[PDB]
Amino acid sequence: PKSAIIYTTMGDIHISLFYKECKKTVQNFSVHSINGYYNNCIFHRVIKHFMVQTGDPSGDGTGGESIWGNEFEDEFFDHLNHSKPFMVSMANCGPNTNGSQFFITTVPCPWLDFKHTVFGKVTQGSKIVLDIEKVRTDKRDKPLEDIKILNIKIN
């Protein structure tokens, strides 16, 4: 899988995938995407000037599972980092706790290097990500109006 398009209710985010390096992470993402696993997932956690986060079908914030059921390992690479905004990374709760949840950064996040697997980068629709992060959220950072993934196309 070389690239993806995430169709959302606010528009489309095109992503290149780091398939050479992050083989398992890209597989988890692409298989879920194709099976429709991410369809109707909301952006459940949005933090302005930081990141927008999605990939939990429950919408709770703790939900979602990898294609293996069990959580899987991080895949870190020096050349894959958060020095630029609009990187696509796995959410986690510590080392080797990858499920289905992922985020897109809106600012450089180098403090996340070697803590989150970077598995893609936005190539079109960064303005959509910037639109998403500006929405009104509650005290738990959940948008007041749901922003939804409709489909993810894998190329």
The CA dihedral of 151, 107, 117, 101, to the nearest 10 degrees, is -40
Just list the catalytic residues. 45, 50, 53, 92, 103, 112, 116
SS3 per residue for the chain: CCEEEEEECCEEEEEEECCCCCHHHHHHHHHHHHCCCCCCCECCEEECCCEEEECCCCCCCCCCCCCCCCCECCCCECCECCCCCCEEEECCCCCCCECCCEEEECCCCHHHCCCCCEEEEEEECHHHHHHHHCCCECCCCCECCCCEEEEEEEC
Question: In whole angstroms, what is the distance from residue 53 CA to residue 44 CA?
Answer: 6
The residue segments making up the domain with residue 17 are 1-155
- Which pair of structure tokens corresponds to residue 91? 């959410």
Asked if 64 and 56 count as a contact pair (C-beta separation under 8 A), the reply is yes
- Which pair of structure tokens corresponds to residue 66? 């990898």
Beta carbons within 8 Å of 70's beta carbon, 6+ residues apart:
none
Asked if 150 and 36 count as a contact pair (C-beta separation under 8 A), the reply is no
- Experimentally, how was this structure solved? X-ray
- Which pair of structure tokens corresponds to residue 5? 């398009």
Amino acid sitting at position 116: H
Question: In whole angstroms, what is the distance from residue 47 CA to residue 134 CA?
Answer: 8
Beta carbons within 8 Å of 23's beta carbon, 6+ residues apart:
75
Asked if 27 and 67 count as a contact pair (C-beta separation under 8 A), the reply is yes
Give the CATH number for residue 94. 2.40.100.10
Pick the closest to residue 48 from 139, 109, 136, 146 (CA basis).
Answer: 136
CA 84, 116, 44, 147 dihedral sign is positive
Question: In whole angstroms, what is the distance from residue 37 CA to residue 152 CA?
Answer: 9
Question: What resolution, expressed in A, was reported for this entry?
Answer: 1.8
Q: How many domains, the chain? A: 1
